[PDB]
Design a binder for these strands. Sequence first.
DNA 1: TTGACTCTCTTAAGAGAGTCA
DNA 2: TTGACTCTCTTAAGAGAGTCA
Lengths: 162, 162
Amino acid sequence: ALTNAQILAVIDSWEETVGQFPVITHHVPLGGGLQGTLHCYEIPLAAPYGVGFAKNGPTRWQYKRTINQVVHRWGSHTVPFLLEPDNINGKTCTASHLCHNTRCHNPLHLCWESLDDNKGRNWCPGPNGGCVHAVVCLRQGPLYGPGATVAGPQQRGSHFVV
Amino acid sequence: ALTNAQILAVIDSWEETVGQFPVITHHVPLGGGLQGTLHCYEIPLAAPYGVGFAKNGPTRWQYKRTINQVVHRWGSHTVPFLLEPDNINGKTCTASHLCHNTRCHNPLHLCWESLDDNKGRNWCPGPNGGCVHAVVCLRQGPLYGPGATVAGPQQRGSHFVV
DNA sequence: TTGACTCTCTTAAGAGAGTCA
DNA sequence: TTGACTCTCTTAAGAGAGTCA
Ligand SMILES: [Mg+2]
Ligand SMILES: [Mg+2]
Ligand SMILES: [Zn+2]
Ligand SMILES: [Zn+2]
Ligand SMILES: [Zn+2]
Ligand SMILES: [Zn+2]
């Protein structure tokens, strides 16, 4: 809600609730042939999810609180960043999973960045493979690699140059 | 169905027409601080676009040929790949701009791969900066870099560990 | 047969809001 | 007030198909 105090109270209640979500250990590629360990705090697969939480899509949730007799609702991963600018360079800020684990609500696994920055982490080589993200990746992106290209650049005639 | 000879004739007509598009020289980052040059064959901004071409969206076009009284139509960048498999690993193949220049129809700037592989090239460090794409990038992706993250991982209390 | 428009859809990273009990 | 559902929307890489002359 409006006041900084009210916002801090929302963040604190969210952290307390998410802090009781099951902690699931995931071993992850870091790049450079190395492996690390992340501890994700995973929202349950089915109701009940936790005080204030409800599922609005297959892997979408919202956090809800009643302040001054009014319901306030946010995307479930946006709550850590309620005191941050909601845009950057004219682009909407989004909650971005450094652990690439949607059900996870560990704020130590989230950052707040444009949708382009968010998406791009899927292909990052990782913190031990050359990540250049200023807010560093926690793991190599799940889609990093050579790809599976079916056909490369080609011409039948002689009209084109690279 | 069109014979493989009829399909080759469509690719040849397409190449003939695209080869007469304005050719624009672009200097581009290759990664590793090196600069290179790409020559894009750019479809016009407004009608007429060229024989067989029409705009179906702000940056979407289609190619159309009528053969034995049947109208055939294809996405304008898909024509080089009409003799290739159209899916891989259960994923639809898409035309993927190695030059990241949507108006370009140079087939030496296109490859044929899943939408995930396609998107991922936006963040590639480039052929002189560590590209691992098996079909190699022609340039550093336009979105490669440190990013512009507004807020990083953080907690107010002590409920979480990484 | 052709040109120049029109419309909606896919994907996978993300969102907002309403209906009931 | 709180819970458990319902619906559609955004973005930027990509698509298929209809109408009229
Ligand atoms: Mg993400
Ligand atoms: Mg692309
Ligand atoms: Zn996590
Ligand atoms: Zn990274
Ligand atoms: Zn090009
Ligand atoms: Zn590459």
